PDB file of C-alpha atoms in Angstrom:
ATOM      1  CA  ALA A   1     -10.120 134.860 -73.806  1.00 20.95           C
ATOM      2  CA  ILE A   2     -11.293 136.777 -70.706  1.00 17.59           C
ATOM      3  CA  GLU A   3     -13.680 134.156 -69.258  1.00 19.08           C
ATOM      4  CA  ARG A   4     -16.110 134.819 -66.376  1.00 20.32           C
ATOM      5  CA  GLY A   5     -14.715 134.591 -62.818  1.00 21.13           C
ATOM      6  CA  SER A   6     -11.341 133.730 -64.433  1.00 20.30           C
ATOM      7  CA  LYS A   7      -7.980 134.943 -63.060  1.00 18.48           C
ATOM      8  CA  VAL A   8      -6.773 137.904 -65.169  1.00 19.13           C
ATOM      9  CA  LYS A   9      -3.485 139.706 -64.436  1.00 17.65           C
ATOM     10  CA  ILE A  10      -4.102 143.446 -64.908  1.00 17.68           C
ATOM     11  CA  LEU A  11      -1.541 144.925 -67.342  1.00 15.59           C
ATOM     12  CA  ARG A  12      -2.598 148.596 -67.110  1.00 16.76           C
ATOM     13  CA  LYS A  13       0.377 150.888 -66.340  1.00 12.32           C
ATOM     14  CA  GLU A  14      -1.688 153.706 -64.772  1.00 16.40           C
ATOM     15  CA  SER A  15      -3.895 151.521 -62.531  1.00 18.04           C
ATOM     16  CA  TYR A  16      -4.413 151.370 -58.741  1.00 16.55           C
ATOM     17  CA  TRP A  17      -4.202 147.542 -59.015  1.00 16.15           C
ATOM     18  CA  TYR A  18      -1.585 147.255 -61.808  1.00 19.13           C
ATOM     19  CA  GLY A  19       0.629 144.152 -61.384  1.00 17.99           C
ATOM     20  CA  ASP A  20      -2.083 142.363 -59.336  1.00 19.88           C
ATOM     21  CA  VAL A  21      -4.630 139.777 -60.547  1.00 19.96           C
ATOM     22  CA  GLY A  22      -8.427 140.123 -60.230  1.00 17.64           C
ATOM     23  CA  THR A  23     -11.541 137.921 -60.607  1.00 17.08           C
ATOM     24  CA  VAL A  24     -13.487 138.771 -63.809  1.00 13.89           C
ATOM     25  CA  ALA A  25     -16.920 140.064 -62.703  1.00 12.52           C
ATOM     26  CA  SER A  26     -18.635 140.781 -66.049  1.00  8.77           C
ATOM     27  CA  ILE A  27     -18.030 142.137 -69.575  1.00  7.04           C
ATOM     28  CA  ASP A  28     -19.864 144.875 -71.526  1.00  2.75           C
ATOM     29  CA  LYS A  29     -21.036 145.099 -75.164  1.00  4.81           C
ATOM     30  CA  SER A  30     -17.839 146.895 -76.294  1.00  7.18           C
ATOM     31  CA  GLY A  31     -19.599 150.200 -75.490  1.00 10.83           C
ATOM     32  CA  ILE A  32     -16.401 151.652 -73.968  1.00 10.70           C
ATOM     33  CA  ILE A  33     -12.649 151.024 -74.404  1.00 12.21           C
ATOM     34  CA  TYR A  34     -12.658 149.270 -70.984  1.00 13.41           C
ATOM     35  CA  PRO A  35     -15.903 147.211 -70.789  1.00 11.69           C
ATOM     36  CA  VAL A  36     -14.373 144.409 -68.639  1.00 14.08           C
ATOM     37  CA  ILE A  37     -14.735 145.215 -64.912  1.00 14.78           C
ATOM     38  CA  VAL A  38     -12.480 143.036 -62.705  1.00 12.24           C
ATOM     39  CA  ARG A  39     -12.821 142.495 -58.925  1.00 12.93           C
ATOM     40  CA  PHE A  40      -9.961 143.331 -56.524  1.00 12.62           C
ATOM     41  CA  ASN A  41     -11.652 143.510 -53.064  1.00 14.16           C
ATOM     42  CA  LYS A  42      -9.611 146.729 -52.619  1.00 14.83           C
ATOM     43  CA  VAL A  43     -11.111 150.188 -51.964  1.00 16.79           C
ATOM     44  CA  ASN A  44      -9.499 153.546 -52.842  1.00 18.54           C
ATOM     45  CA  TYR A  45     -11.356 156.205 -50.806  1.00 17.02           C
ATOM     46  CA  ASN A  46     -10.003 159.559 -52.058  1.00 18.84           C
ATOM     47  CA  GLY A  47     -12.992 161.908 -51.610  1.00 20.70           C
ATOM     48  CA  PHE A  48     -16.174 160.333 -50.177  1.00 21.06           C
ATOM     49  CA  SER A  49     -19.054 162.212 -48.492  1.00 20.45           C
ATOM     50  CA  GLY A  50     -22.811 161.564 -48.138  1.00 20.62           C
ATOM     51  CA  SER A  51     -23.425 158.666 -50.562  1.00 17.54           C
ATOM     52  CA  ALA A  52     -20.991 155.773 -49.964  1.00 21.19           C
ATOM     53  CA  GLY A  53     -19.090 155.695 -53.286  1.00 19.74           C
ATOM     54  CA  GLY A  54     -16.571 152.818 -53.110  1.00 19.92           C
ATOM     55  CA  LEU A  55     -15.265 151.104 -56.274  1.00 16.92           C
ATOM     56  CA  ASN A  56     -13.914 147.546 -55.747  1.00 18.43           C
ATOM     57  CA  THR A  57     -13.923 147.178 -59.583  1.00 19.11           C
ATOM     58  CA  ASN A  58     -11.609 148.641 -62.257  1.00 18.96           C
ATOM     59  CA  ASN A  59     -12.464 148.872 -65.981  1.00 17.20           C
ATOM     60  CA  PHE A  60     -10.022 147.162 -68.384  1.00 14.81           C
ATOM     61  CA  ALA A  61      -9.947 146.332 -72.117  1.00 15.48           C
ATOM     62  CA  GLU A  62      -9.735 142.699 -73.314  1.00 14.70           C
ATOM     63  CA  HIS A  63      -6.159 143.168 -74.606  1.00 14.62           C
ATOM     64  CA  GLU A  64      -5.335 145.001 -71.331  1.00 11.91           C
ATOM     65  CA  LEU A  65      -6.037 141.844 -69.264  1.00 14.95           C
ATOM     66  CA  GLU A  66      -3.874 138.690 -69.435  1.00 16.77           C
ATOM     67  CA  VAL A  67      -5.965 135.551 -68.740  1.00 15.97           C
ATOM     68  CA  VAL A  68      -3.452 133.364 -66.850  1.00 17.03           C
ATOM     69  CA  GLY A  69      -5.990 130.712 -65.762  1.00 15.20           C
TER      70      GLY A  69
END
C-alpha cells in the first residue's frame, strides 16, 4: 500500500516524471481520482509571472503508483 515517505515508482503515461520514483508526501480522502501527491524535487516552469507558482508535487491515484519499498 502507498505508505508515507515510501518509494513509489510513478506509472502514469502522461506525466512529467513518468518512469521516475518519488517520495510519498501525503494522501487525500479520495476526494479526487489522484489524491496521492508524490515529491520529485523537480520544477516545470512553463508560464510563471507575479506569484511564484512552482509544483514539485504530482497527483497520482493509488493504483497509479507502484510501492517498490
